[PDB]
């Protein structure tokens, strides 16, 4: 009864930046020996779990996220590094008991022109909390009269598209990052790694 990980990594369609899909899975047997022994990733920074010592501890739920960013944004998704995408699309707490994992997929999302559904959140009139998603198409008002239309007066659509073509630099290629989130709730551990 192995835990289903094919739907998270070996998927076909991935989500967007502003709406990161969750993949809560439990009541399984999660073999972690397929993550750290697979030469197909770029970052494997497990924060405070000692990835070698994961096949003995048991947890309760494993939350698997999945979204698409560019090369110069993979290092921004980590505790201790902020920038453009730090408080607009995704913000991680400063405990991160999971393992940030990413790989460069430049053969499925790098067509001529590219898919225009990858919309990163631009300047927002708010802040961001750990594990907080916000799917909103409201035009950003910088302080003037609200347009309440389609770029009426000083309005900007906050879902700026990405330019993904098979001719850009490595720092602008479509990446795919999966960030697991382990936890320990007040319940018997139903998922382990024997």
């Amino acid at each position: 009864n192995l835990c289903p990980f094919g739907e998270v990594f070996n998927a076909t369609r991935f989500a967007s930046v502003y709406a990161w899909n969750r993949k809560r899975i439990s009541n399984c047997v999660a073999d972690y020996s397929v993550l750290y022994n697979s030469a197909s990733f770029s970052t494997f920074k497990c924060y405070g779990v000692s990835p070698t010592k994961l096949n003995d501890l048991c947890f309760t739920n494993v939350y698997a996220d999945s979204f698409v960013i560019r090369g110069d944004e993979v290092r921004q998704i980590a505790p201790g590094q902020t920038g453009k995408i730090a408080d607009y699309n995704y913000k991680l707490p400063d405990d991160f008991t999971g393992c940030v994992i990413a790989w460069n997929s430049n053969n499925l999302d790098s067509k001529v022109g590219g898919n225009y559904n990858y919309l990163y959140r631009l300047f927002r009139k708010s802040n961001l909390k750990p594990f907080e998603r916000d799917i909103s198409t409201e035009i950003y008002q910088a302080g003037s009269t609200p347009c309440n239309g389609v770029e009426g007066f000083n309005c900007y659509f906050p879902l700026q598209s990405y330019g993904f073509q098979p001719t850009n630099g490595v720092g602008y290629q479509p990446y795919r990052v999966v960030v697991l989130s382990f936890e320990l709730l007040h319940a018997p551990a139903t998922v382990c790694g024997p």
Partner: peptide, 13 residues
């Protein structure tokens, strides 16, 4: 000192 030439230093261990 162990200074990374190019790329992020927090990639792997």
């Amino acid at each position: 000192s162990c200074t990374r030439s190019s790329g992020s230093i927090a990639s792997n261990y």
